[model samples]
Target: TSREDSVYLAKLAEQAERYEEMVENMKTVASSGQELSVEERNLLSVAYKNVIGARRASWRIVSSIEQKEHQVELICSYRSKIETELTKISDDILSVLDSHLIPSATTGESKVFYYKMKGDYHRYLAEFSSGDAREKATNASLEAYKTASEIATTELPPTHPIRLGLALNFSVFYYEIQNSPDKACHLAKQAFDDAIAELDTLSEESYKDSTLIMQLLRDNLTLWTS
Candidate 1:
């Protein structure tokens, strides 16, 4: 089996927004026990994110409308179905990252990437969960983000996309999950400043990605501050 061809097909499928094919193709590479390069990591991330994201959006829409209207058992049932799918997809990806990818990752960047992915998926679960279940998902997400952060802040350069991306996401966790805008603002500001200080060190390819996250951090900071 050519893992190379799988990755190629995954990328093409992602371009067409057919994430089911993307997930199937990337799964071949992800479970093959071969080390994932940054490109492959990004491809896998895209696949699962989109596949899970469509359901997440639907869940949000259904939940909001369900709340706005009076008790509609049918809408409640649809929301429940979306929630079930979300839980399954998020749990499955988190398992894949923990068992297949993280163990094979050799560098700080790769480890950070996989851990951050874990955090993101857990956060997705927390978004729909309640009470003790939400608390559990929140703690798991926070722990994974912290693990990624500890490695990223020390090992990766400030201008590195993985570092900024971790900061961007962890800050988001604080804002949305923890309900702490101050913490979120502080994290984003620090990341934005640190990157700007070392702006000259960015590579041509990395510049685009790093700067994009920086912009997001800045936007979030602005939103939180105002």
Candidate 2:
């Protein structure tokens, strides 16, 4: 079968919330040695994002239950399982990026997308990880975001969706991972201000995407400030 077949199957799987199947089919297309179209990249990212999102949400719920009911041994075992799943999913996606996606990315936008994905997954790892593992993921996530941010600023238009999204998430990592709300607000506000100054440069195709992320940045700034 062709790569499109795999991508199409992956899309169907995504619609059904069968993310493991989506990841399986998408991996075939990703490793097919062809440059991914923007939509293909979106599919790949969405698959892993949801896969990891479920475990993180579960971890949050279970840990809260542990707090209320002191079933120490059972809850600890379950929490460990969730943490391991988070680590595994994050590792799988990062490996895919390193081995398949990032190396093949030939354009600035693609690089930013892959690197930002790298950072996002690593931040997810940092969220449930402990001690040395937590520190390592935090630093890795920070490095990946910084790399994406530098490339975005130099190579992408200021209001480009990728650049703006990078700024938004980078600020998030600072606030949530590093415990730096002031830094988060500063970066979010900077992205929002920079884009507002260049609002006239928005392209019709990406206007919705760029403006939506700008709204997120503004929202985060408001939340962090108050």
Candidate 3:
């Protein structure tokens, strides 16, 4: 096979992996009946939608590649259409998540939800803004970071490893999504400090494994940061 064929095959494999990951994630969410933090539920929902959009895009790309190989000229316009469809799907998911965060008193996993919502809001604005809209969106994201910081300091329990892990994950987003690296570093430091303080309190042998804690932290960190 030619290099182009190899590239197409690789992309197809990657798309399949993404689809399989999405299915497994969906199954996990469905099995967990405990009331999910608003952020968790929104993440799952938006991720599922994004994966579905990605699958469609992958199919179109594959079809286009195949047509090109057979001497059929597939218009670049078809690729553009696929891009637009993917963007719309992303925007729709972000819109739903962002609208839910506009109200202040909505409380459930305060720190996690606040950071996740802020991240989504910033991303949506960045993707869909014009000149003046861009300026306003940037300022709004700064304010959201401030609000998230306040919530993180107040509501997050100092001794909860999972909560601390969540804060670190959110902190990574605060930096990457909202363009606030200082704020991200601050929150990340605090979460680690708290997690260390709580080390002596946890009695479970499984919980005492630092390797396990680090694995969880890195996994979530990668998810939001990526």
- For 1-226, candidate 3 gives per-residue lDDT tens digits of 4433433443453456654454334334423433435444444544544565564656466555756542443544555465455555545444544544334335535545545455444544543344776667566655655566466556654544435544654565566556666666666666666667766655464365443555555554455455
Regions of candidate 3 where Cα sits further than 4 Å from its true position: 1-87, 98-107, 124-137, 159-166, 173-183, 200-226
Residue 220 deviation, candidate 1, in Å?
0.3
Q: Quick one: ranking by TM-score, best first?
A: 2, 1, 3
Against the hidden reference, what TM-scores do the models get?
Answer: 0.95, 0.97, 0.46
Candidate 2: where is the Cα deviation over 4 Å?
A: none
Please list the C-alpha lDDT of all candidates, in the order they appear: 0.90, 0.91, 0.52
- Predicted candidate 3: what Cα RMSD to the true structure? 11.8
**Candidate 1 Cα RMSD after full superposition onto the native fold (Å):** 1.5
**Highest lDDT: which candidate?**
2
All-Cα superposition RMSD per candidate = 1.5, 1.3, 11.8
